[PDB]
């Protein structure tokens, strides 16, 4: 699955300016590596591929 971090945008990797596809800015998104289930109290631990450095 893909999780999207809403207020944090991708950059152009050389220039370091935020990306904009003309409607909105394109937010950063990462991918779940392995299946992860949530325990009581409602909090999840997950490993993601792609990093918001």
């Amino acid at each position: 699955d893909q999780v999207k971090f809403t207020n944090t945008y991708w950059l152009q990797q050389q220039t370091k300016q935020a990306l904009y596809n003309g409607a909105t800015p394109i937010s950063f998104t990462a991918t779940v590596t392995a299946d992860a289930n949530s325990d009581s109290g409602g909090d999840v631990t997950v490993t993601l591929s792609g990093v918001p450095i």
């Binding site: 945008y9 904009y20 909105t24 800015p25």
Partner: protein, 53 residues
């Protein structure tokens, strides 16, 4: 807008106290404008650097 010097008027009337203005955009949105210009809008140069002793 120059009464003594109308030669240089850029605009139709004079901005006066109480005139309505507005901003172009939406409050906090981050965006990436396209540009248009003419060759003589801006210019660029570079200064040759001497070498340290």
């Amino acid at each position: 807008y120059d009464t003594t010097n109308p030669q240089y008027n850029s605009v139709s009337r004079q901005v006066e106290a109480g005139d309505a203005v507005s901003v172009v955009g939406t409050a906090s949105q981050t965006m990436k404008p396209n540009l248009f210009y003419n060759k003589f809008f801006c210019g660029l140069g570079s200064i040759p650097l001497p070498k340290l002793h």
